[PDB]
Design a protein around this nucleic acid. Structure first.
Ligand SMILES: [Mg+2]
Length: 87
RNA sequence: GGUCACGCACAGGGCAAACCAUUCGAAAGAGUGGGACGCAAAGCCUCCGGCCUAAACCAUUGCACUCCGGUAGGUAGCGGGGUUAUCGAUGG
């Protein structure tokens, strides 16, 4: 189950990539070092984001702490990524 | 001479990238003026394949790391194709 990456669901689709990545970084940087934040705004990737943590514990902390956080109108749904493939 | 090609020329010459100023545009970018990287169609057309932007509208609750909805705008100086044009090596 636990992954270096957390997967954020239910994000506001009307926010630009630039500002969304910027915000997501402000939200999640306080839980630990982030390797990258993946945001695409393609049909398949809309309203979703991948935050990749240096450490699994700091990924687990973010998920536990920030479930359903009011974020640009919508409550963030967070799960672990199903796979990692950061390599 | 005309036509379909072709570009090693010759003649007239033509266009104008980046960057800047300014205007329109949510943006990509486009218009105009200055400016030349280059260009034998770098004249013009978005029918086809790409690439870029993606605000609004419609749709989508979606697990990616190759990129990808519709729609709309852009690129004709990314390519194809269409159509029009100067000269004529001896040039085919
Ligand atoms: Mg950081």
């Amino acid at each position: 189950r636990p992954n270096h990456t957390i997967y954020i669901n239910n994000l506001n689709e009307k926010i630009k990539k630039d500002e969304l990545k910027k915000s997501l970084h402000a939200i999640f940087s306080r839980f630990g070092q982030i390797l990258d934040i993946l945001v695409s705004r393609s049909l398949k990737m809309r309203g979703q984001a991948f935050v990749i943590f240096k450490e699994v514990s700091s990924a687990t902390n973010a998920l536990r702490s920030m479930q359903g956080f009011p974020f640009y109108d919508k409550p963030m749904r967070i799960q672990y990524a199903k796979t990692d493939s950061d390599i």
